[PDB]
Ligand SMILES: O=C(Nc1ccc(N2CCCC2=O)cc1)c1cnc(-c2ccccn2)nc1
Ligand SMILES: O=C(Nc1ccc(N2CCCC2=O)cc1)c1cnc(-c2ccccn2)nc1
Ligand SMILES: N[C@@H](CCC(=O)N[C@@H](CS)C(=O)NCC(=O)O)C(=O)O
Ligand SMILES: N[C@@H](CCC(=O)N[C@@H](CS)C(=O)NCC(=O)O)C(=O)O
């Protein structure tokens with residue numbers, strides 16, 4: 001297909017889509033807009049949010065909807081219907097956490113202390129739950145890498161920016177990050193992508 | 199399999215799963231717990247959250263991951279892979295809004311103010327986007343009912359409790375509600391379920 005992904009110049013909620021394209025060796029236009037471009041683009045989007053993915057003249061939206069679409073019938077999906085559910089549920093558990101952060105929020109009275117509350121008190125419970133869920137296994141679900149592993153690495157990267165001691169009590173969770181980053185297609189993308197904070 | 203759904207005695211995040219079981223005429227145990235039971239239940243859960251669905255002794259979590267799993271290979275899924283992506287995208291757009299609300303906020307005055315603000319300043323943009331998306335079509339995606347239509351009815355039922363005039367400018371969204379509510383298996387569940395505020 002002719003794929004055009006639109007997002008800010010940011011990893012953000014588009015990065016999961018970028019990893020999937022890289023891993024699958026799928027070519028695409030990685031369209032990154034400026035903040036001053038946004039207002040006029042927003043009017044044309046179905047629900048006024050990005051990322052959007054244009055597929056052969058058709059517009060898809062919602063990052064995880066698009067990610068699931070792209071990984072259907074690939075080796076990233078989960079090997080049984082039940083394991084597909086586990087993949088979706090890990091992604092949604094991580095997304096629920098990331099979506100609690102006031103990313104847009106201006107007021108840095110609340111924004112900072114809301115961040116620091118989420119990072120100091122809640123992140124460790126999540127980390128302990130992910131660690132326990134992973135146990136001694138190589139990947140989060142099944143016997144091979146899934147896009148949930150990708151999302152863990154993507155989500156944990158942004159979290160480690162603000163709380164660099166996040167994984168100090170969880171070596172097994174660090175190892176999983178490194179495992180993902182070492183997949184040649186992923187490594188290649190990580191090496192050549194725009195360096196951005198978020 | 200044998201299914202056991204655990205949630206509070208509330209529609210909440212479990213109701214999408216309960217609609218799907220009703221529509222598919224699948225028997226399940228509807229386990230509803232009290233607050234008092236919460237700490238004991240929680241200790242068993244993978245990520246500290248309900249609903250969970252136990253399936254032949256194995257636990258699934260995340261309401262939307264579970265609903266997707268249950269609708270797979272059914273007429274509620276979306277008739278093609280692109281329609282399935284649209285189903286997912288509409289569901290996540292609804293869920294993103296519902297997740298903004300401070301459901302568990304202890305301070306009543308702060309809770310009511312945030313609800314009122316979200317419903318007054320934010321909801322109308324979503325309702326207009328959904329109306330535009332639906333246009334004159336019968337259902338949100340494709341030519342037959344999907345679990346996206348279910349989730350619209352379920353979400354809009356709870357929002358209308360707090361903002362009765364929510365849909366006064368959008369009769370086509372009311373009509374969609376009525377059509378879901380008129381499906382015989384869903385109508386039966388609606389008539390029979392425990393009556394709870396939320
Ligand atoms: O920074 C984000 N979003 C963002 C920033 C700014 C603004 N606007 C534009 C200019 C000023 C402003 O407030 C709007 C949205 C963000 C970045 N990563 C993630 C994210 C999600 C999931 C997983 C990982 N990462 N989520 C959100
Ligand atoms: O009221 C909700 N949740 C809720 C309340 C209370 C508590 N308890 C636990 C211990 C203390 C406490 O506060 C936990 C959860 C709720 C209700 N509807 C929805 C919801 C989401 C999506 C679609 C439809 N409906 N989401 C959440
Ligand atoms: N759950 C959606 C979130 C989409 C979303 O809210 N995106 C933000 C940027 S990270 C946005 O476009 N905001 C635009 C606005 O509200 O003006 C997804 O994952 O795609
Ligand atoms: N996105 C998740 C949310 C899970 C969640 O947080 N559920 C709430 C109940 S609505 C919970 O378990 N809360 C415990 C508490 O607030 O004390 C899902 O759809 O299942």
Ligand SMILES: [Mg+2]
Pocket residue numbers: 092095096290293294
């Ligand atoms: Mg979500």
